[model samples]
Target: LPPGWEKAMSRSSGRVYYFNHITNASQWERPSEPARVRCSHLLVKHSQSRRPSSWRQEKITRTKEEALELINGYIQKIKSGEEDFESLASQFSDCSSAKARGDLGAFSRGQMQKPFEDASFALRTGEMSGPVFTDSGIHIILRTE
Candidate 1:
């Protein structure tokens, strides 16, 4: 296992949570010079609902602090469990993942961006992470252990 990798215990059956993060690479209109900075951080999961198409991306121009604040606020809502996952993801998610109910299937290490990987691996199972800022916007991740 990597330095911080560990087994997670879950309240739910057949569920295990591992730390991970997702980030998009920078691009340009004509592929000349890359954008000054990348776009954003995203939450990922390797599960039935998770797939490449399900990973959502939001474009945010705010400072990292501001983005984190927004993401943290959203995380609070998810923790409440009062809202439907799909509905909430759709309302808040900025990428196609919203359409897929915010699912991003299993991915190899280094598949995601630097910031996302850093923030995600820091979380423990059943833990709420994020409000961790990225270029595009704020992000919140919930790991199911």
Candidate 2:
């Protein structure tokens, strides 16, 4: 393993890794450029009723408006110090990373869907922003680093 590399696992896919390294070569030399963000998110996917024949067919547990409201409430709780982002995410987020408390870890620009990436890269560390909408769902993002 490379220096600073460590064993890790993906909560969503159960994929395991032996080391940590930059997964995107284009961004390798720009590590210090503020071009990456570590974040967690709560996603509430669009309802099956809205897109009945979609390939993924993941059940939508809540309507878009309801999801937005719910995520906003969680953000409020986080802002007020009443709840931790990870805990709330694990309990409520629709994304696979919910198993890791919604952690998407550090990702460079262009590694995510445009809207999600836009919201993530725009936040300062320790910031929280969203109910940003995308084709997949609504996201409540917490930028950790």
Candidate 3:
């Protein structure tokens, strides 16, 4: 808690509140908790379709192995501080999130595809994970939370 603040309760939502020193000013706020992972990802879609959906078809020429190797190189660059994650994502990631520097924002359990969600949650803050394969493509992920 910050200075001059005390915990109180509200009837509308039974939510928590912080009371000010002035006694009249009060505001409801969600209590701080352990943060869920905020992550960014770089995707390299497989050249061939694994699933039958037309949307599953990727426009890239690389095979899954080639995509994985390419992403691995990016990982090396990140580890060596030779390239930035956002820059690499913008240049190489296949998903639309590339526009936002590959930002997928924050997510909790069950909010993403199983493999992606599992890998995201498993990583510690500032850790990166994958060449994780999902139905959509291969991904290299960074946990930014």
Candidate 4:
């Protein structure tokens, strides 16, 4: 993640792992995104989100700061290679896109929220965004395109 470290998994255990193809090293841990600009996201609901309500958690109850800490932590888990993004979305999102293996389909312009659209376009070159602050919440975006 930090330029070389990457996340991987062990076949026999079905547990996540990490590797550095750049360095030929491996380990077990969590670590930490990308877009049609094919992209995905992991969002967190905060106190002021338009509708903190989600399919899994209805009483969305987290302050902005708290939510951000959570978002940032997930990034660490992902980058450290200890966690995977898609399943995180499966557990965290209400949009059902997570069920699609965390994909937002093909992120074309004019297809989603304005902030989300812009954020994806911004990272269309980088493959991922650390986190985007929006009224919707803190977004950890990934790019496939």
Candidate 5:
């Protein structure tokens, strides 16, 4: 946590505060929108892994252009209704998630990288997007709206 943050409960006593919040009157004036749930699948193609001290494996950084190309390819495949999710993920994903068939399980928006975050939320369910470049490699994100 950062400085000036405090732990406190809400007035209704139903919510526990992990961090202190600002109490500006203007803060609660935003319009409300319907809740949206987002889910996605991705196929990421990574270059060969680099061994760093045996237990740690690192991937070579991909240039922005290269990452874009890789992601775009996957998006094309998936958007065409191709069901080869696992195979594509294995071929592309740099993380251990590839082993699990691109099953990132469940995650929220903030948990991913910036480029990924942008691409992820910009999609509708069962829709595919990306070839968005991140520091990692290329990512092919399939948003299951």
Candidate 6:
């Protein structure tokens, strides 16, 4: 199967159903959509962004290019299994949600920026994005349950 897709048996119907380990989604059909989503993020800000100050820093002075490079380095750590997502977010994310270990709780559509929201909704629960750019900063989004 694909990266996230898994073959499983349904308890009620005694038939095969498709499960996505990453998204926390299961269906009798092929694939799917969702009603609500939850996320945790690691946001890295640059001086060029609208708000350069964060709880972690009074003034983020890195250039946008430099910030991207930093985030990319972070991705390497996480993807290769050396870094833990939630703890990393709590330490590094620029958003206030960092206090909650980068959790954004749960939100529906139309609540976040278009690019960020689209990228989030497209992920499975256990997956992490590379880097998402928005007005606030560059973000690494993880779709939680």
Candidate 1 weakest ten by summed lDDT: 25-34
Write the residue-wise lDDT of candidate 2 on 72-103 in tens digits.
Answer: 78877886789988898888776668789989
Model 3 agreement with the true structure over 1-145: per-residue lDDT tens digits: 6433478888788887866432122456532223477999988776663542222234456677887788778888887899999999988777778888999999878688887877776565775774677887778888789
- Model 4 Cα lDDT, one tens digit per residue, 45-126: 8878988877768788889999888887888888778888877878875455667766776757778887677666654343
Q: After superposition, how far is residue 89 of candidate 1 from its true place, in Å?
A: 1.2
**Candidate number with greatest TM-score:** 6
Per-prediction TM-score:
0.48, 0.67, 0.68, 0.68, 0.52, 0.76
The model with the greatest lDDT is 6
RMSD of each: 14.8, 14.7, 15.9, 9.4, 14.5, 9.4
- List runs of model 6 lying over 4 Å from the truth: 1-32
User: Candidate 5, residues 33-116: lDDT per residue as tens digits?
Assistant: 113435444534344213211112344445455655766666666656684666777655666666666666545666776766
lDDT per model vs. reference: 0.44, 0.66, 0.71, 0.70, 0.49, 0.81
Model 2 C-alpha lDDT versus the unseen true structure: 0.66
The sequence of per-residue lDDT tens digits that candidate 6 reaches over residues 26-112 is: 566765358999988889999988989999889999999999998888887887789888778888888899899899989999999
Better of 1 and 4 by lDDT: 4
On a 0 to 100 scale, what is the lDDT of residue 131 in model 4?
64
Task: Tell me the TM-score of model 5.
Answer: 0.52
Q: Which ten residues in a row have the lowest lDDT in candidate 3?
A: 49-58
Better of 3 and 6 by lDDT: 6
lDDT of 1 by residue, 14-118 (tens): 465543233111111211111121222233321221232233333233444554555555555665776644566666565666665555544434766565555
Which candidate model has the greater TM-score, 1 or 4?
Answer: 4
